[PDB]
Short mmCIF file of all heavy atoms in Angstrom, two decimals:
data_model
loop_
_atom_site.label_atom_id
_atom_site.label_comp_id
_atom_site.label_asym_id
_atom_site.label_seq_id
_atom_site.Cartn_x
_atom_site.Cartn_y
_atom_site.Cartn_z
N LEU A 1 -11.43 -8.37 -20.72
CA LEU A 1 -12.12 -7.13 -20.50
C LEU A 1 -12.08 -6.24 -21.70
O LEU A 1 -10.94 -5.99 -22.25
CB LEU A 1 -11.50 -6.39 -19.30
CG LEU A 1 -11.49 -7.17 -17.97
CD1 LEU A 1 -10.78 -6.34 -16.93
CD2 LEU A 1 -12.94 -7.54 -17.48
N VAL A 2 -13.19 -5.79 -22.23
CA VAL A 2 -13.31 -5.01 -23.46
C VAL A 2 -14.22 -3.78 -23.29
O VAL A 2 -15.18 -3.84 -22.51
CB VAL A 2 -13.85 -5.84 -24.64
CG1 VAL A 2 -13.86 -5.00 -25.89
CG2 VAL A 2 -13.02 -7.05 -24.83
N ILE A 3 -13.89 -2.69 -23.97
CA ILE A 3 -14.73 -1.51 -24.05
C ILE A 3 -15.21 -1.29 -25.50
O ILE A 3 -14.42 -1.32 -26.45
CB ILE A 3 -13.99 -0.24 -23.55
CG1 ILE A 3 -13.80 -0.38 -22.05
CG2 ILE A 3 -14.74 1.03 -23.86
CD1 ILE A 3 -12.78 0.60 -21.45
N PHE A 4 -16.53 -1.11 -25.66
CA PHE A 4 -17.09 -0.70 -26.93
C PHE A 4 -17.67 0.71 -26.68
O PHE A 4 -18.70 0.86 -26.11
CB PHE A 4 -18.18 -1.61 -27.43
CG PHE A 4 -17.76 -3.03 -27.68
CD1 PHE A 4 -18.31 -4.06 -26.90
CD2 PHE A 4 -16.85 -3.34 -28.66
CE1 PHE A 4 -17.91 -5.36 -27.13
CE2 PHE A 4 -16.48 -4.65 -28.89
CZ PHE A 4 -16.98 -5.69 -28.12
N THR A 5 -16.94 1.74 -27.16
CA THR A 5 -17.37 3.12 -26.96
C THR A 5 -17.68 3.84 -28.29
O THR A 5 -16.87 3.83 -29.23
CB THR A 5 -16.32 3.90 -26.18
OG1 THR A 5 -16.75 5.22 -25.95
CG2 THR A 5 -14.98 3.89 -26.90
N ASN A 6 -18.85 4.45 -28.38
CA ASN A 6 -19.22 5.36 -29.45
C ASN A 6 -18.63 6.67 -29.20
O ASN A 6 -18.87 7.29 -28.19
CB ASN A 6 -20.79 5.52 -29.51
CG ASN A 6 -21.48 4.46 -30.33
OD1 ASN A 6 -20.88 3.52 -30.86
ND2 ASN A 6 -22.80 4.55 -30.41
N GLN A 7 -17.79 7.19 -30.14
CA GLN A 7 -17.14 8.48 -29.99
C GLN A 7 -17.26 9.26 -31.32
O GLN A 7 -16.25 9.57 -31.94
CB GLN A 7 -15.67 8.35 -29.57
CG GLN A 7 -15.46 7.77 -28.15
CD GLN A 7 -16.08 8.62 -27.05
OE1 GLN A 7 -16.23 9.85 -27.21
NE2 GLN A 7 -16.42 8.01 -25.91
N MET A 8 -18.50 9.57 -31.73
CA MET A 8 -18.73 10.15 -33.02
C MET A 8 -18.27 11.62 -33.06
O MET A 8 -18.16 12.22 -34.16
CB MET A 8 -20.21 10.04 -33.38
CG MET A 8 -20.52 10.54 -34.80
SD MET A 8 -22.21 9.93 -35.49
CE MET A 8 -23.33 11.00 -34.35
N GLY A 9 -17.93 12.16 -31.91
CA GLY A 9 -17.33 13.49 -31.85
C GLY A 9 -15.98 13.57 -32.47
O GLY A 9 -15.53 14.64 -32.92
N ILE A 10 -15.26 12.41 -32.54
CA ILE A 10 -14.00 12.31 -33.24
C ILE A 10 -14.22 12.44 -34.76
O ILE A 10 -13.54 13.21 -35.42
CB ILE A 10 -13.25 11.05 -32.83
CG1 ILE A 10 -12.95 11.03 -31.35
CG2 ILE A 10 -12.01 10.88 -33.67
CD1 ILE A 10 -12.53 9.69 -30.86
N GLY A 11 -15.13 11.62 -35.30
CA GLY A 11 -15.46 11.74 -36.73
C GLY A 11 -16.04 13.06 -37.09
O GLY A 11 -15.91 13.50 -38.24
N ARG A 12 -16.81 13.67 -36.16
CA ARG A 12 -17.46 14.98 -36.38
C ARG A 12 -16.53 16.15 -36.26
O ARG A 12 -16.86 17.29 -36.51
CB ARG A 12 -18.65 15.16 -35.46
CG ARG A 12 -19.83 14.26 -35.67
CD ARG A 12 -20.71 14.76 -36.81
NE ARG A 12 -21.16 16.13 -36.57
CZ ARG A 12 -21.72 16.92 -37.47
NH1 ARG A 12 -21.83 16.51 -38.76
NH2 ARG A 12 -22.12 18.13 -37.17
N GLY A 13 -15.32 15.88 -35.69
CA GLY A 13 -14.34 16.92 -35.61
C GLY A 13 -14.33 17.66 -34.26
O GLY A 13 -13.50 18.53 -34.03
N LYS A 14 -15.26 17.28 -33.37
CA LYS A 14 -15.38 17.99 -32.13
C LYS A 14 -14.23 17.63 -31.17
O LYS A 14 -13.80 18.45 -30.39
CB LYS A 14 -16.74 17.66 -31.49
CG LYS A 14 -17.91 18.32 -32.21
CD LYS A 14 -19.23 17.76 -31.73
CE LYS A 14 -20.43 18.33 -32.48
NZ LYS A 14 -21.68 17.78 -32.06
N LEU A 15 -13.78 16.37 -31.26
CA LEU A 15 -12.87 15.82 -30.28
C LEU A 15 -11.64 15.19 -30.98
O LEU A 15 -11.83 14.17 -31.71
CB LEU A 15 -13.59 14.80 -29.42
CG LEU A 15 -12.80 13.79 -28.57
CD1 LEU A 15 -11.91 14.52 -27.54
CD2 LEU A 15 -13.76 12.87 -27.85
N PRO A 16 -10.46 15.76 -30.85
CA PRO A 16 -9.25 15.20 -31.44
C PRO A 16 -8.96 13.77 -30.96
O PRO A 16 -8.98 13.55 -29.74
CB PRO A 16 -8.14 16.20 -31.01
CG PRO A 16 -8.88 17.43 -30.67
CD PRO A 16 -10.18 17.02 -30.09
N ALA A 17 -8.63 12.86 -31.87
CA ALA A 17 -8.38 11.49 -31.49
C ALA A 17 -7.30 11.32 -30.45
O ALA A 17 -7.42 10.53 -29.53
CB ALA A 17 -8.05 10.63 -32.75
N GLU A 18 -6.22 12.14 -30.54
CA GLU A 18 -5.07 11.98 -29.61
C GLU A 18 -5.50 12.43 -28.19
O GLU A 18 -4.97 11.91 -27.21
CB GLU A 18 -3.90 12.80 -30.15
CG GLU A 18 -3.34 12.25 -31.45
CD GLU A 18 -2.75 10.82 -31.30
OE1 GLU A 18 -2.00 10.57 -30.37
OE2 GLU A 18 -3.10 9.97 -32.19
N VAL A 19 -6.40 13.39 -28.09
CA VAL A 19 -6.91 13.81 -26.79
C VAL A 19 -7.69 12.63 -26.18
O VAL A 19 -7.50 12.28 -24.99
CB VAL A 19 -7.87 15.01 -26.87
CG1 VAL A 19 -8.48 15.30 -25.49
CG2 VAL A 19 -7.09 16.23 -27.33
N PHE A 20 -8.60 12.04 -26.94
CA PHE A 20 -9.30 10.89 -26.43
C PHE A 20 -8.34 9.78 -26.03
O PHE A 20 -8.49 9.17 -24.96
CB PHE A 20 -10.29 10.37 -27.48
CG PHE A 20 -11.20 9.26 -26.96
CD1 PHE A 20 -12.14 9.59 -26.03
CD2 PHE A 20 -11.03 7.97 -27.45
CE1 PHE A 20 -12.99 8.57 -25.57
CE2 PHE A 20 -11.88 6.98 -26.94
CZ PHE A 20 -12.84 7.27 -26.05
N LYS A 21 -7.38 9.50 -26.86
CA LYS A 21 -6.40 8.44 -26.60
C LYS A 21 -5.76 8.63 -25.25
O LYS A 21 -5.63 7.70 -24.47
CB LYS A 21 -5.31 8.36 -27.69
CG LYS A 21 -5.86 7.84 -29.00
CD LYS A 21 -4.84 8.03 -30.08
CE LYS A 21 -4.80 6.94 -31.09
NZ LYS A 21 -3.76 7.12 -32.12
N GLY A 22 -5.31 9.90 -25.01
CA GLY A 22 -4.71 10.19 -23.72
C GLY A 22 -5.71 9.97 -22.57
O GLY A 22 -5.33 9.50 -21.52
N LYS A 23 -6.96 10.32 -22.85
CA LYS A 23 -7.96 10.19 -21.78
C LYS A 23 -8.21 8.73 -21.47
O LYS A 23 -8.28 8.34 -20.28
CB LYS A 23 -9.28 10.87 -22.16
CG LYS A 23 -10.35 10.77 -21.07
CD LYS A 23 -11.57 11.63 -21.43
CE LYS A 23 -12.78 11.32 -20.56
NZ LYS A 23 -13.99 11.98 -21.04
N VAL A 24 -8.34 7.86 -22.52
CA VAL A 24 -8.60 6.47 -22.31
C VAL A 24 -7.45 5.81 -21.54
O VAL A 24 -7.70 4.87 -20.73
CB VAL A 24 -8.68 5.70 -23.64
CG1 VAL A 24 -8.49 4.22 -23.45
CG2 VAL A 24 -10.06 5.97 -24.31
N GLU A 25 -6.19 6.11 -21.85
CA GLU A 25 -5.05 5.46 -21.18
C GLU A 25 -5.07 5.85 -19.68
O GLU A 25 -4.75 4.97 -18.84
CB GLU A 25 -3.73 5.81 -21.87
CG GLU A 25 -3.79 5.48 -23.36
CD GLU A 25 -2.39 5.36 -23.97
OE1 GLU A 25 -1.44 4.97 -23.25
OE2 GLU A 25 -2.25 5.63 -25.17
N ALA A 26 -5.37 7.12 -19.37
CA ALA A 26 -5.37 7.53 -17.99
C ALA A 26 -6.51 6.86 -17.26
O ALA A 26 -6.33 6.40 -16.10
CB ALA A 26 -5.52 9.04 -17.93
N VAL A 27 -7.66 6.71 -17.86
CA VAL A 27 -8.75 5.95 -17.29
C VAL A 27 -8.27 4.51 -16.99
O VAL A 27 -8.39 4.05 -15.86
CB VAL A 27 -9.94 5.89 -18.26
CG1 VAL A 27 -10.91 4.82 -17.82
CG2 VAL A 27 -10.63 7.26 -18.35
N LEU A 28 -7.80 3.82 -18.02
CA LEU A 28 -7.31 2.51 -17.89
C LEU A 28 -6.26 2.41 -16.75
O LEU A 28 -6.33 1.42 -15.93
CB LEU A 28 -6.73 1.97 -19.20
CG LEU A 28 -7.67 1.92 -20.38
CD1 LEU A 28 -7.04 1.14 -21.55
CD2 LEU A 28 -9.07 1.32 -20.04
N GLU A 29 -5.42 3.38 -16.64
CA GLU A 29 -4.37 3.42 -15.58
C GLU A 29 -5.05 3.35 -14.22
O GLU A 29 -4.59 2.65 -13.32
CB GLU A 29 -3.54 4.69 -15.62
CG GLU A 29 -2.63 4.87 -16.79
CD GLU A 29 -1.33 4.14 -16.68
OE1 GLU A 29 -0.90 3.88 -15.49
OE2 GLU A 29 -0.72 3.84 -17.71
N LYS A 30 -6.13 4.11 -14.08
CA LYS A 30 -6.90 4.22 -12.86
C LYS A 30 -7.68 2.94 -12.56
O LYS A 30 -7.76 2.47 -11.45
CB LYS A 30 -7.84 5.44 -12.96
CG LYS A 30 -8.77 5.68 -11.78
CD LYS A 30 -8.03 6.30 -10.58
CE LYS A 30 -9.00 6.50 -9.43
NZ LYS A 30 -8.34 7.22 -8.28
N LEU A 31 -8.30 2.32 -13.60
CA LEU A 31 -9.03 1.08 -13.43
C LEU A 31 -8.17 -0.12 -12.97
O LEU A 31 -8.63 -1.04 -12.31
CB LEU A 31 -9.78 0.72 -14.72
CG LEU A 31 -10.96 1.69 -15.07
CD1 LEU A 31 -11.58 1.34 -16.41
CD2 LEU A 31 -11.97 1.60 -13.94
N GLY A 32 -6.90 -0.07 -13.37
CA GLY A 32 -5.91 -0.98 -12.85
C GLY A 32 -5.96 -2.39 -13.46
O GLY A 32 -5.37 -3.28 -12.84
N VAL A 33 -6.67 -2.59 -14.52
CA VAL A 33 -6.75 -3.90 -15.21
C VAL A 33 -6.51 -3.68 -16.68
O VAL A 33 -6.79 -2.59 -17.21
CB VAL A 33 -8.06 -4.57 -15.02
CG1 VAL A 33 -8.24 -5.19 -13.65
CG2 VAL A 33 -9.17 -3.61 -15.34
N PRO A 34 -5.95 -4.72 -17.36
CA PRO A 34 -5.76 -4.68 -18.82
C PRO A 34 -7.06 -4.68 -19.57
O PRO A 34 -7.84 -5.58 -19.47
CB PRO A 34 -4.97 -5.98 -19.11
CG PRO A 34 -4.40 -6.38 -17.73
CD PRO A 34 -5.39 -5.93 -16.75
N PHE A 35 -7.24 -3.68 -20.43
CA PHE A 35 -8.42 -3.60 -21.29
C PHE A 35 -7.96 -3.56 -22.75
O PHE A 35 -6.94 -3.05 -23.07
CB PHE A 35 -9.21 -2.32 -21.08
CG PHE A 35 -10.38 -2.45 -20.11
CD1 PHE A 35 -10.16 -2.15 -18.79
CD2 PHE A 35 -11.59 -2.80 -20.53
CE1 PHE A 35 -11.20 -2.26 -17.83
CE2 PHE A 35 -12.64 -2.91 -19.66
CZ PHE A 35 -12.48 -2.60 -18.33
N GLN A 36 -8.86 -4.09 -23.63
CA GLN A 36 -8.83 -3.78 -25.00
C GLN A 36 -10.04 -2.82 -25.34
O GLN A 36 -11.15 -3.15 -24.96
CB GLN A 36 -8.94 -5.05 -25.85
CG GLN A 36 -8.70 -4.90 -27.31
CD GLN A 36 -8.70 -6.21 -28.00
OE1 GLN A 36 -9.62 -7.03 -27.86
NE2 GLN A 36 -7.65 -6.51 -28.77
N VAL A 37 -9.78 -1.78 -26.04
CA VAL A 37 -10.75 -0.72 -26.29
C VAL A 37 -11.03 -0.51 -27.78
O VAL A 37 -10.11 -0.31 -28.56
CB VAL A 37 -10.18 0.64 -25.74
CG1 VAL A 37 -11.24 1.76 -25.93
CG2 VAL A 37 -9.76 0.49 -24.29
N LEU A 38 -12.28 -0.60 -28.19
CA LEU A 38 -12.70 -0.32 -29.54
C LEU A 38 -13.52 0.95 -29.58
O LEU A 38 -14.48 1.12 -28.80
CB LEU A 38 -13.46 -1.49 -30.14
CG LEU A 38 -12.59 -2.72 -30.45
CD1 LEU A 38 -12.34 -3.56 -29.17
CD2 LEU A 38 -13.18 -3.60 -31.53
N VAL A 39 -13.19 1.86 -30.52
CA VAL A 39 -13.79 3.18 -30.60
C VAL A 39 -14.43 3.45 -31.91
O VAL A 39 -13.79 3.56 -32.94
CB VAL A 39 -12.71 4.26 -30.33
CG1 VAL A 39 -13.36 5.63 -30.18
CG2 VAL A 39 -11.89 3.96 -29.10
N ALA A 40 -15.75 3.63 -31.94
CA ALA A 40 -16.52 3.99 -33.12
C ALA A 40 -16.42 5.50 -33.30
O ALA A 40 -17.14 6.26 -32.68
CB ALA A 40 -17.95 3.53 -33.05
N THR A 41 -15.57 5.90 -34.23
CA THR A 41 -15.31 7.34 -34.43
C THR A 41 -16.35 8.00 -35.35
O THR A 41 -16.45 9.23 -35.37
CB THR A 41 -13.89 7.52 -35.05
OG1 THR A 41 -13.79 6.77 -36.23
CG2 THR A 41 -12.82 7.08 -34.10
N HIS A 42 -17.10 7.16 -36.06
CA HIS A 42 -18.02 7.65 -37.10
C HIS A 42 -19.44 7.05 -37.04
O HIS A 42 -19.69 6.15 -36.29
CB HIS A 42 -17.44 7.35 -38.50
CG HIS A 42 -16.25 8.19 -38.89
ND1 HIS A 42 -14.98 8.01 -38.36
CD2 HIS A 42 -16.11 9.22 -39.74
CE1 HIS A 42 -14.12 8.86 -38.88
NE2 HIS A 42 -14.82 9.65 -39.74
N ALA A 43 -20.31 7.59 -37.90
CA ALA A 43 -21.57 6.92 -38.07
C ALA A 43 -21.35 5.61 -38.81
O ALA A 43 -20.33 5.43 -39.49
CB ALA A 43 -22.51 7.82 -38.89
N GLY A 44 -22.34 4.71 -38.72
CA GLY A 44 -22.37 3.58 -39.64
C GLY A 44 -22.08 2.23 -39.00
O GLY A 44 -22.51 1.98 -37.87
N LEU A 45 -21.33 1.41 -39.71
CA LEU A 45 -21.16 -0.03 -39.39
C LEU A 45 -20.67 -0.29 -37.97
O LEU A 45 -21.08 -1.23 -37.32
CB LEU A 45 -20.22 -0.70 -40.41
CG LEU A 45 -20.79 -0.76 -41.83
CD1 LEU A 45 -19.66 -0.98 -42.85
CD2 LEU A 45 -21.85 -1.85 -41.96
N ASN A 46 -19.81 0.57 -37.46
CA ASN A 46 -19.15 0.39 -36.17
C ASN A 46 -19.88 1.07 -34.98
O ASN A 46 -19.60 0.82 -33.82
CB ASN A 46 -17.71 0.78 -36.20
CG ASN A 46 -16.92 -0.07 -37.11
OD1 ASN A 46 -17.19 -1.27 -37.28
ND2 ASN A 46 -15.92 0.54 -37.79
N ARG A 47 -20.83 1.99 -35.31
CA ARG A 47 -21.52 2.73 -34.29
C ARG A 47 -22.66 1.94 -33.64
O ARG A 47 -23.54 1.49 -34.32
CB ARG A 47 -22.14 4.01 -34.90
CG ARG A 47 -22.98 4.83 -33.91
CD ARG A 47 -23.44 6.17 -34.56
NE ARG A 47 -24.22 6.96 -33.60
CZ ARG A 47 -23.74 7.58 -32.59
NH1 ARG A 47 -22.43 7.51 -32.31
NH2 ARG A 47 -24.51 8.25 -31.77
#
């Protein structure tokens, strides 16, 4: 199980990475299964 999430608000400065990190872990806690999560923080190759 994998997540590919665009989060350009982190690269843009709108959203602190540690806030998102906390949000993702709580989500995962709720989903109840092991995930690997990839986060595109910026424009370009990973977006």
Side-chain angles (χ1 to χ4, degrees):
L1 302 178
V2 183
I3 291 165
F4 300 117
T5 182
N6 273 0
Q7 293 299 333
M8 184 161 72
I10 299 169
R12 290 281 301 166
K14 290 169 182 178
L15 164 59
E18 296 296 313
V19 174
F20 187 68
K21 289 167 146 185
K23 181 172 165 189
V24 162
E25 304 200 30
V27 166
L28 301 190
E29 293 279 335
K30 179 77 182 184
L31 290 175
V33 284
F35 267 92
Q36 189 174 51
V37 183
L38 289 80
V39 189
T41 54
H42 287 76
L45 295 159
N46 296 326
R47 178 174 179 71

